[PDB]
Amino acid sequence: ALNKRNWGYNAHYKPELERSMKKVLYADPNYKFPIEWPERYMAETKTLEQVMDEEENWEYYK
Amino acid sequence: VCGIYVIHVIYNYMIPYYWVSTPLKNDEFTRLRMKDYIASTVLEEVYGISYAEWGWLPHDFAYNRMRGLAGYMHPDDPRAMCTSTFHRKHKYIEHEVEKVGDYHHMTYPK
Amino acid sequence: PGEVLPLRIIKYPLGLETIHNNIFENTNNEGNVELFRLRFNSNSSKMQHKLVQDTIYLTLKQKRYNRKKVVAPQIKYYKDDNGNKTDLVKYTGKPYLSNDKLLKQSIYDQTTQYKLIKKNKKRGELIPVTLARRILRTKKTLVLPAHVNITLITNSYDIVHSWFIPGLGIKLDCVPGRSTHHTFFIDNVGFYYGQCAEICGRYHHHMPIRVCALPFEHFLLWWNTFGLPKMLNTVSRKRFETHYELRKYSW
Amino acid sequence: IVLTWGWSSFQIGGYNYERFDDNGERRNTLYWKLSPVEFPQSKLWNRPS
Amino acid sequence: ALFFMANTAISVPSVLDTSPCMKQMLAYEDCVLDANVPQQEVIHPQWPTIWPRLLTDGKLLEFDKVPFHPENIYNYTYMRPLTKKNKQYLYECEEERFVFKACLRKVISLKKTDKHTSWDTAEVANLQLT
Amino acid sequence: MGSVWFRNRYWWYRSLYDDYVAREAKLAFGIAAFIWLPHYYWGIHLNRAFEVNFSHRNYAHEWGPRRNRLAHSLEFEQFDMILENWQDLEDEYAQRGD
Amino acid sequence: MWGNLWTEASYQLNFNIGFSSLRSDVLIHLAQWQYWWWFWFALIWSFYYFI
Amino acid sequence: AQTAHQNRYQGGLCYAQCNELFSFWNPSIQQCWKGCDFGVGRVNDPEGRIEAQQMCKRWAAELYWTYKGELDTIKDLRVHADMYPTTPQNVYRACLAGVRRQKF
Amino acid sequence: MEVKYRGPSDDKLECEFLENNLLSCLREKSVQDNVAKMTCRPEFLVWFFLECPTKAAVYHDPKGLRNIFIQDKIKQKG
Amino acid sequence: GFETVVPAPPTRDDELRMIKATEEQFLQQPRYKLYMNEAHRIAKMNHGDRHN
Amino acid sequence: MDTIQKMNYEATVNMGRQDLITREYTFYSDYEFIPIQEDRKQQMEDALNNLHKIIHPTVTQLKKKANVQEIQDRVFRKLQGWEGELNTCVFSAKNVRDSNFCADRFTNRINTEGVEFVKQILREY
Amino acid sequence: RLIEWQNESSLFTVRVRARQWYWIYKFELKNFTDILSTPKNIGNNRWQIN
Amino acid sequence: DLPADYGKMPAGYNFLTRGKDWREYDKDFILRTDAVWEKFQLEHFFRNYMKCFFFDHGLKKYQMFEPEDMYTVVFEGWALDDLITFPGFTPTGRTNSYQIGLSPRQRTVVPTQTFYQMQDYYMLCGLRFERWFRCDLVYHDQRHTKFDQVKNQKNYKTYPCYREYYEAQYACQDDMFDFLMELAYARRAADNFESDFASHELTTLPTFYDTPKAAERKTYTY
């Protein structure tokens, strides 16, 4: 437990302002990031048209 | 001392050179890397990072830490495997990294 | 020699490409992976085409500075040169870089100034090498980024040479027939001069080197504006072409 | 001749150079924090190089 | 070796950042990175006004008399208008953007005046000495 | 230090070189105890200068681009304020219609 | 000289005794090592002076 | 070089298990050590193990260029002695093996 | 990296060019780039403030900006 | 030839059992036999026993 | 088309037309043989496609490249023996009739013996 | 340790050729894409690839 | 309490703050006493660092030249050539001012560890070129038929030997690559495959890797 470290994984934004909406959105357990952290650093495979269609059809979880 | 050093150099560099001299059907790369590991991973040019503070000052130590991480980022490197880790703080004083392993990128030390 | 046989059966290599974890790379039109290929020879008494040279290199030739007899004015012609060249002259000027970093029109004879400074320049006992670069002038300085590793592959055309930069303390022996690889890392923004450090012959003394390590933004600007256009100048060369390339590849 | 001059000349010279010449600093520079440092004398001129 | 240098100046600390709105800028940049918008112009806090078309059409450059031959998704990232997902994940970062813009406006409003007397010897107050 | 640690000092002198320079070797300590102070202090100063240079290099490498981006954003914000004022003036002009 | 950014790294004078430049990390390390090389000769120099 | 310990002996039994798993000339031992470090303090937790696996995915992606879905579509996750870290799939497999070998 | 100091140039031609670029950018941004052709140069917008503080102050001045807008409208109409 | 069925990834209990087995083997390794930790260590030890 | 498109089309056509210009150059001292006919070429391609169709399920199901490599090596040894037979027969063939006879023999030998051997080895695997 | 044994890890490759009596520097075509794919450091030490 | 839809973008929301009051954000940031001095220093540094171009009173435009030494810039400012119009750091006017690092490495088919001890890399270059030519002897004539060199570039597939080609190019200098390309041309013209000439495997010593069951030789574990 003492030696446990994050090693730079999933080091997303950590809000400091009290009224920043992220400070509540990240607290919300049912929050989906735009892309998974491992995939955030991997090359895209879908074509431009497919990506645009997926983004257009995407719906916010709330 | 010179004779022992020369014997070690021979064992690592001269005799293994003759093991493979033609293309190999099976496991050619494996055998080539087997014969090359003993020569390319000699401690003379690998050991020393464990006591890098002898020559690297704190700020210089952090800069050289990031530089070495970038240089040895390549996974396929037995020399990097045998080299001492760069994920550590200067023993005298650290100014950049407060805790080891608490980064924003798995590769960049900062 | 021996003639190309009428038919050859060639095994398709397997496992060369690990993309998407697909051992088989060739699939038949009917939807079946192909393990073998049949290659047929027609017109056996025929020549074989030479391998097409598909290697593109941006090449900079660094040579010693050449004296200028006359300082020609900057002249720009009209665009849309559908012919060999446009005789009409759009702009003609004599810009000079002032101490204010402005290209102002010169009110002096540039050739006269050049001749006077060539003949009777003022020197001193303790003059910095920066202001005294007599035997350290070249053209097309090599521009690199700073704070990043670069792989330098050293070689020679005729005999052994030495690429020497004392400012960086880097000495690389360029030997014919060898492809020695070196790691190059400049941890600061700076301009470095150098000379050759291996007897080569007539102009061993006069063979300088100029290497400028710049912040990545300036390096990328220089690349896009001077080098990247040249890499396609061999086939396509125009202002619109350069604009298209720089818009298509934006960093 | 042997000891005191040899072991104090370079340090005295560097101290005086820092005093009276700003260790050869080239002025007209901006934001010393970002600017490089012009080091004091470090090569022993009195010692045989 | 062990103590060949014979001394280490541990006292000399890492020089502290003193820029006015560095923290706000870094927070906004981190929020934008989390949003993961392919366009880079969003790095500027005033992107919706500097490039208004980024929300409607996405055409930020006039491609007149110049060919437009995209090859993949990384060719003309600045020519693609923001989608609903990008707009949502950027709206989630408005609070940081407002603070950053307010800090920038305050810095702009602040001006030099003859009242200041330590302007010449401001390096000590800036902590340039070690 | 040296011969005193040995209970056979004659053997200590003989087995090394069969030569006797002990007088000078033991009188040199007094001079050596103070000949090093100027060099040591100048070296401390030089090491501090090197440390400051390294810290400045690290700070530049890490923050110079950040400062440039901050300045760029500040100028863009100035332009944004000017643009807001220009939009207000244009709206007023459209409403009035000279 | 890249604009107002002076990229020149060597400003040695006609009678330079040290390295051409000290901006490079390698040269900085070499200069520091050379300076501290002569620091560890006090006892030997005193002994030779007495001899 | 990129591990959490100055020498492999400082690391616990996981480093020895990695050495046994991979041949002495195979540099996948370093990736196995990275997996061990990721799994330190997480294997004994149902969420910690998944977090360590995701850390392995991220580490492989940062080490080598990779596409989306390759690591998910890897056919066999097992590792043999002569497997080298020449591909993201191999790096990920070695990291997973290290995480599995990790005890605490 | 040593950067040498140099105050704003305040060159007449340079500031005129920068002011023309700024005016074009303002005209396009007022309509939100609803124009046949775009001529905005944000880099030159930055350089305008970096190099010509006097014109920036005039633009910030409510009266100066009003006069500039009136003159621009008159020129466009004529 | 034919390929055997590949088992699903082991669970934490299976990992613990494997760790215990490896520890038992390491302890069983004789002290006076100097064999390096590697994939072929057990094969090398068997070869050495046959050679002895 | 734009200038870039025209250049790309020109490059593609020139790269494809290498044989067009290479045909004009021929060597006098050359053991010229009778090329295999187009019908026989298509028949042999169809036989190869049939072999690939028979082999596709087992190789696709297999997950280790070693077994696929062994199967490929064995099938290649058989096909290479048959290829040597075909080459020696066709090269000495003195007419298109003999060339067609040799090609028909080769393709029939494939379709029967190679098919049986492939089925046997696949069942073994 | 810093100035050697890092050829495998470099941003791009430059070929330096020496001739009688000038230098030649060659940038391979892959250097263009290597430079285009350079990671950017933004935010609190975060890295992004565009 | 929150409205249960906190963070949702309102329909038709526009990213405009034309009439926003910034006084409410004053307490969310802290400015040091030398904010004005810092602003002026930032402006000075940006102007003197990012400005690699110079305005010309003749063309009424910004022009630039390749990096030059201080001697050339100072003592030959009146004699300059190759001036080119300044195009801007980025097409859209954004900032390229970032700290760059090292990009993730490319997967390797022929490892450099085969001859990594040698810094010359001549053996590695030879091996990589041999492997590339082995792949070429298979795919060279199909390159123009069903690969990148097809006329219909829309349905194009990357040449299978691309990675081997790039690795060989990296390992080989241009002159050695030209030598090897001449050898490759001769070998392709002869239509010679190394398989039909190789008989040294008979004289090579046996090893565990030569076992008749290569597939069963390997042992897999989790």
Ligand SMILES: CCCCCCCCCCCCCCCCCC(=O)OC[C@H](COP(=O)([O-])OCC(O)COP(=O)([O-])OC[C@@H](COC(=O)CCCCCCCCCCCCCCCCC)OC(=O)CCCCCCCCCCCCCCCCC)OC(=O)CCCCCCCCCCCCCCCCC
């Ligand atoms: C060109 C010209 C210019 C130069 C150009 C440059 C040229 C470059 C050339 C480069 C050449 C490279 C090679 C260099 C080497 C060459 C060597 C060579 O050729 O000659 C061979 C030469 C031959 O040997 P040597 O040097 O002659 O040996 C003699 C000894 O070194 C000497 O020691 P010794 O034991 O024989 O005699 C001394 C001893 C003998 O004296 C004694 O009798 C001992 C007494 C001990 C007790 C003292 C206290 C008693 C108190 C009593 C009560 C008092 C009253 C009460 C008061 C109470 C309150 C105050 O007394 C002492 O001084 C020792 C005292 C202990 C010190 C530490 C004490 C710490 C606590 C404080 C105690 C005292 C103060 C407090 C007092 C009370 C406070 C309350 O050297 C060698 O053998 C080889 C040397 C190789 C180098 C490494 C050597 C390591 C081994 C140790 C020796 C180190 C020193 C010598 C090094 C050599 C240089 C000096």
Ligand SMILES: CCCCCCCCCCCCCCCCCC(=O)OC[C@H](COP(=O)([O-])OCC[N+](C)(C)C)OC(=O)CCCCCCCCCCCCCCCCC
């Ligand atoms: C009588 C007392 C005996 C004492 C026992 C020790 C001495 C035994 C006899 C001499 C041989 C000593 C060999 C030691 C090293 C063996 C292994 C080896 O070479 O590799 C390790 C190392 C090499 O390590 P490496 O770099 O190859 O590392 C291998 C591991 N990887 C690949 C992962 C990095 O050997 C050397 O570096 C040799 C350097 C030359 C000098 C060696 C001096 C040894 C110590 C002094 C011995 C003095 C003997 C005097 C005898 C007469 C007087 C009594």
Ligand SMILES: CCCCCCCCCCCCCCCCCC(=O)OC[C@H](COP(=O)([O-])OCC[N+](C)(C)C)OC(=O)CCCCCCCCCCCCCCCCC
């Ligand atoms: C057995 C033989 C062994 C021989 C070993 C080899 C010895 C080699 C060294 C020999 C040194 C000889 C003495 C040199 C004195 C130089 C003093 C000098 O200029 O200052 C240097 C140093 C240089 O420091 P600086 O501050 O002047 O300048 C540094 C350089 N700048 C400024 C450019 C960065 O200054 C001092 O040391 C200042 C104090 C000097 C005090 C002593 C003055 C003595 C004057 C000469 C002797 C007296 C005159 C009559 C002599 C009659 C003799 C018969």
Ligand SMILES: CCCCCCCCCCCCCCCCCC(=O)OC[C@H](COP(=O)([O-])OCC[N+](C)(C)C)OC(=O)CCCCCCCCCCCCCCCCC
């Ligand atoms: C720079 C500051 C000093 C740093 C400390 C460095 C010294 C570290 C200790 C080294 C001990 C091992 C030395 C090996 C070589 C011994 C050779 C020899 O003749 O020994 C047999 C001797 C035998 O001497 P003997 O006189 O009893 O018998 C020999 C005579 N016949 C043959 C007639 C019998 O044993 C010793 O006395 C051992 C002495 C060890 C100390 C070193 C002696 C040399 C002078 C330096 C003294 C240093 C003191 C250090 C104190 C501790 C500080 C941490």
Ligand SMILES: CCCCCCCCCCCCCCCCCC(=O)OC[C@H](COP(=O)([O-])OCC[N+](C)(C)C)OC(=O)CCCCCCCCCCCCCCCCC
């Ligand atoms: C069995 C072999 C030994 C074990 C392996 C040791 C390897 C690691 C250390 C090797 C390098 C040692 C030198 C470091 C740099 C200092 C050099 C120096 O001062 O030399 C000048 C000195 C002489 O020059 P000097 O007289 O100018 O010394 C400086 C004088 N003042 C203080 C006035 C400035 O060297 C010597 O002759 C003395 C020996 C060196 C100094 C030793 C100090 C004690 C430390 C313990 C030594 C015993 C070994 C253990 C080492 C600790 C770590 C394990």
Ligand SMILES: CCCCCCCCCCCCCCCCCC(=O)OC[C@H](COP(=O)([O-])OCC[N+](C)(C)C)OC(=O)CCCCCCCCCCCCCCCCC
């Ligand atoms: C010219 C006459 C030549 C006559 C002999 C020629 C025939 C072949 C002889 C082969 C002898 C092999 C002996 C192996 C001994 C292994 C011992 C051991 O346990 O090692 C374990 C080590 C490490 O392996 P390990 O320790 O992991 O293995 C476990 C070992 N046991 C079971 C004991 C625990 O083995 C090796 O390192 C492999 C063998 C190394 C051999 C080194 C040879 C050095 C040669 C120097 C240069 C000589 C040039 C001569 C030029 C002549 C010119 C005319």
Ligand SMILES: COC1=C(OC)C(=O)C(C/C=C(\C)CC/C=C(\C)CC/C=C(\C)CC/C=C(/C)CC/C=C(/C)CC/C=C(\C)CC/C=C(\C)CCC=C(C)C)=C(C)C1=O
């Ligand atoms: C710790 O302190 C120390 C140092 O730190 C400074 C050290 O560096 C060092 C290292 C130093 C060394 C190893 C020694 C270095 C060398 C030294 C000191 C010697 C240097 C000497 C010189 C530069 C002087 C050269 C000598 C000369 C005679 C030159 C000529 C000068 C003069 C005045 C005479 C001119 C005459 C002529 C040219 C000839 C004219 C006459 C004739 C032809 C005769 C005609 C005949 C008739 C009959 C009329 C040490 C040892 C040290 O202890």
Ligand SMILES: CCCCCCCCCCCCCCCCCC(=O)OC[C@H](COP(=O)(O)OCCN)OC(=O)CCCCCCCCCCCCCCCCC
């Ligand atoms: C002290 C006791 C311990 C043992 C001491 C051993 C000392 C060995 C001394 C050998 C001297 C050989 C003759 C003198 C040669 C001097 C010049 C030289 O070495 O030239 C270099 C040359 C290498 O040729 P090159 O074309 O450069 O190819 C190498 C590529 N890396 O070099 C060569 O051509 C190398 C030739 C090597 C021949 C080796 C033959 C024996 C092999 C035995 C295998 C191991 C088992 C048996 C060991 C028995 C030991 C007695």
Ligand SMILES: CCCCCCCCCCCCCCCCCC(=O)OC[C@H](COP(=O)(O)OCCN)OC(=O)CCCCCCCCCCCCCCCCC
């Ligand atoms: C012609 C020759 C005649 C004989 C020789 C006489 C002396 C001549 C002059 C010698 C040269 C002096 C000048 C050059 C060396 C000193 C340089 C110096 O002091 O630099 C500063 C340095 C510490 O500064 P730093 O913090 O690193 O940098 C920031 C500065 N604010 O300073 C330091 O390191 C701090 C120093 C603190 C004060 C030290 C006082 C020493 C007193 C000694 C008493 C007697 C001996 C005691 C010995 C005890 C140990 C055995």
Ligand SMILES: CCCCCCCCCCCCCCCCCC(=O)OC[C@H](COP(=O)(O)OCCN)OC(=O)CCCCCCCCCCCCCCCCC
């Ligand atoms: C006084 C001045 C003169 C002294 C004589 C001259 C020679 C001096 C030699 C150096 C002395 C300094 C001490 C030794 C070096 C210490 C630093 C070091 O090298 O440490 C790293 C490494 C051990 O690292 P690592 O294996 O990871 O540690 C885990 C241990 N369980 O280090 C190693 O490789 C460790 C090697 C251990 C060897 C042990 C030899 C037998 C002694 C065992 C311990 C003592 C037994 C006696 C009783 C102790 C308890 C009372």
Ligand SMILES: Nc1ncnc2c1ncn2[C@@H]1O[C@H](COP(=O)(O)OP(=O)(O)OP(=O)(O)O)[C@@H](O)[C@H]1O
């Ligand atoms: N085409 C390739 N691309 C990249 N790496 C390869 C390639 N071929 C082999 N390797 C490396 O060589 C090692 C051994 O290759 P081998 O042919 O034995 O693998 P395999 O049977 O396909 O399966 P595995 O990936 O499990 O080893 C591979 O693990 C990989 O490290």
Ligand code: CUA
């Ligand atoms: Cu070229 Cu010396």
